[PDB]
């Protein structure tokens, strides 16, 4: 193994490690292509982390200014302050693609607000922070992912990432309300009749499931209008987009299979990523 090999391997154990779902699907395109999404994705994983390290901003400011060194001399040997290793193969990556620097900038800007975390009131706010953490990746992984990006390519894996963090806050609300989270709107939790740490302590009840299927719909509606328009990927990006988005979409009926528990978290096995492989792999 070569010095960068041992920097995008590492990127890889991040990855695996943080999602069995996304690195199934994303170790299937081609070396060159998933080498820059293990890299794009270590990156943000490293940003979303940050604040627990010591308690405080000096990491996540460590890496912003990483990434401020790489968009403004690529060329140039880094002295990096947060993960070298990381920013080593981002700055490999950011040599030989188009990286929208713009979006770990908002990515980080999300990740510093929620130091400040406060209940959504809106539907809107909620969308917003999806936006911030999710669709911001989908936005970066976007020249990765296509042969010739337009405003569509971005808008598709915007909508798509989204998507996936609602799946992620539907698959999680009871372990987030544990860490003092609820994501859910006030006004959707209001309209719907729903306190979260009573349903924590007593169960699901109509209210709930009515509440999170709310939102199980919308996440679903993204997905559709998403593999609608998969033609915006390369060719060999599209049944790999295809089965990373359905891995993922899978834990919607893990959760109502479960019962829509507050108290595990529910998981598509191994076996189930495979057999959705061979069906899409089957349609292409
Ligand atoms: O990191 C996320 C992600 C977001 C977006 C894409 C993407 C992949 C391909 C195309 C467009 C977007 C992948 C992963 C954001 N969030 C929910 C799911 C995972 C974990 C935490």
């Known amino acids: 193994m070569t010095m960068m090999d041992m920097n995008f ?52 400011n460590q890496i912003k200014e990483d990434i401020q060194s790489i968009e403004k001399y690529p060329y140039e040997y880094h002295h990096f302050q947060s993960d070298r290793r990381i920013m080593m193969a981002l700055q490999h990556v950011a040599q030989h693609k188009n990286i929208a620097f713009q979006s770990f900038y908002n990515l980080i800007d999300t990740v510093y607000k929620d130091q400040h975390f406060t209940m959504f009131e809106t539907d809107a706010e909620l969308f917003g922070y999806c936006y911030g953490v999710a669709g911001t990746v989908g936005e970066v992984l976007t020249p990765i992912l296509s042969d ?61 499931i009515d509440l999170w299927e709310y939102y199980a719909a919308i996440a679903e509606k993204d997905f559709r209008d998403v593999m609608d ?16 988005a359905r ?17 595990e978290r529910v998981f598509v096995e191994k076996r189930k990523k495979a057999k959705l492989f061979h069906e899409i792999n089957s349609k292409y």
């Open 148 to 208: 010739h990006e337009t405003h569509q390519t971005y808008d598709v894996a915007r909508r798509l990432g989204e998507s996936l963090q609602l799946i992620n806050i539907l698959r999680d609300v009871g372990e987030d309300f544990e860490n003092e989270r609820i994501y859910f709107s006030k006004q959707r939790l209001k309209q719907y009749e729903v306190d979260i740490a009573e349903v924590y302590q007593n169960g699901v009840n109509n209210h709930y």
């Open 9 to 60: 391997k590492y990127c890889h154990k991040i990855m695996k490690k943080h999602s069995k779902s996304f690195s199934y699907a994303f170790d299937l395109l081609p070396e060159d292509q998933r080498k820059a999404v293990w890299a794009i994705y270590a990156v943000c994983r490293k940003i979303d982390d940050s604040i627990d390290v010591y308690g405080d901003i000096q990491f996540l």
């Open 229 to 244: 328009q998969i033609k915006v990927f390369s060719i060999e990006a599209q049944p790999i987009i295809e089965l990373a």
């Open 247 to 263: 891995i993922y979409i899978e834990i919607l009926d893990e959760v109502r299979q479960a019962n829509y528990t507050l108290h």
